[PDB]
Amino acid sequence: ASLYEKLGGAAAVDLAVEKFYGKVLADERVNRFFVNTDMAKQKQHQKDFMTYAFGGTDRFPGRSMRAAHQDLVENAGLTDVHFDAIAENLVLTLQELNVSQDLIDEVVTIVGSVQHRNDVLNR
């Protein structure tokens, strides 16, 4: 089932993305990685990150994810503590929205993918 199906429609997806966006924007650990991008791009990223986490991982092939995040790794120090922080903000978002524990458990597992983390962190 897709993100839209799991959250129960477009209104729910919009509210989750907005809340996740707001948490990342305010989090000094990770807000800095979105320098030089506009609001719509940031919201799109947080929607994509959430889509991956809810199981839509085929939409984000590893080779593409390596290339996408290479500049962040080499020239902005992106590493595990930052990946952990954005994942934490997602989980907190879902808890504050009272999303089912079962769905949250799945999200925690999938966002913990070793391979997607290795590809994003270019290692």
Binding residues for heme: 41-42, 45, 63, 69, 116
For residue 51, which of 82, 90, 11, 77 has the smallest C-alpha distance? Answer: 90
Q: Is 17 in the site for ligand HEB (CB under 6 A)?
A: no
Instruction: Quote the least distance from Cβ 116 to ligand HEB, whole Å.
Output: 5
Q: Is 30 in the site for ligand HEB (CB under 6 A)?
A: yes
Q: Is 116 in the site for ligand HEB (CB under 6 A)?
A: yes
Q: Is 120 in the site for ligand HEB (CB under 6 A)?
A: yes
Q: Is 41 in the site for ligand HEB (CB under 6 A)?
A: yes
CB-based burial label for 21 (10 Å; 0-12, 13-18, 19+): buried
Q: Measured between alpha carbons, how far is 28 from 92 in angstroms, rounded to an integer?
A: 16
Rounded to 10 deg, the angle between the 80-96 and 39-53 helix axes is: 80
Instruction: Quote the least distance from Cβ 21 to ligand HEB, whole Å.
Output: 12
Amino acid at 98: N
Q: Which of 19, 52, 89, 99 binds ligand HEB (CB under 6 A)?
A: 52
Q: Is 49 in the site for ligand HEB (CB under 6 A)?
A: yes
Residue nearest to ligand HEB (CB): 52
Q: Measured between alpha carbons, how far is 5 from 62 in angstroms, rounded to an integer?
A: 24
